[PDB]
Amino acid sequence: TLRSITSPLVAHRLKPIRQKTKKAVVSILDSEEVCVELVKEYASQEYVKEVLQISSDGNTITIYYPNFPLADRPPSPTDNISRYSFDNLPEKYWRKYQYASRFVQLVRSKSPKITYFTRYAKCILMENSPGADFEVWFYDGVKIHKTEDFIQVIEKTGKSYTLKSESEVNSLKEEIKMYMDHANEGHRICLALESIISEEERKTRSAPFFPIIIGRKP
């Protein structure tokens, strides 16, 4: 089963974007559905063999085969259309779906959800939940970035470097420990705010409660 290899995509709250690539076009429309256009070359123009429209919870997948020439927007669907649900999708479409999944995932990891201003830094929790990327942009120039795996740090001088594992955490210049302490305070806070606002949204029935900016630079 596909569910055993990746999780279903989520396109909620993602800004529209039309990204051309060498073998494909990917588009996040205004409706938040996600479209993937397959591009083939003939003669001297490029066409679109099939279109994969994915719902916002990617649960319902509409896929169609028109013949259309590439354009500024995705082709409109014909009648030769196939409608599938996530768990009955045949292997032939999995690789494409995993392509859209990895794309959405990367966009989420750079699309802010909660911005938070402290007396020393501008925090930014991204949308790639759970274990979302977490940037701490200290005002003095120091940068910090936390992923489920690596943790990137930069210093004013530009000594850009990275770290692995919890082996070196304690043994470090206590100034950098100060930066990490403030960043973990911010992370706990931002996750708490996300959780409580989400819960009220669970009750609520209207317009989104995210993105959200908190505080201000003095």
Binding site: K15, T21, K23, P112
Partner: peptide
């Protein structure tokens, strides 16, 4: 397709726009 790279500069303009309200 599972070879494709898609992280080029138009996406960089998109990301700039994302962080501009900050």
């Amino acid at each position: 397709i599972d070879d494709e790279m898609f992280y080029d500069d138009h996406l960089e303009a998109y990301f700039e726009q994302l962080a501009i309200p900050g």
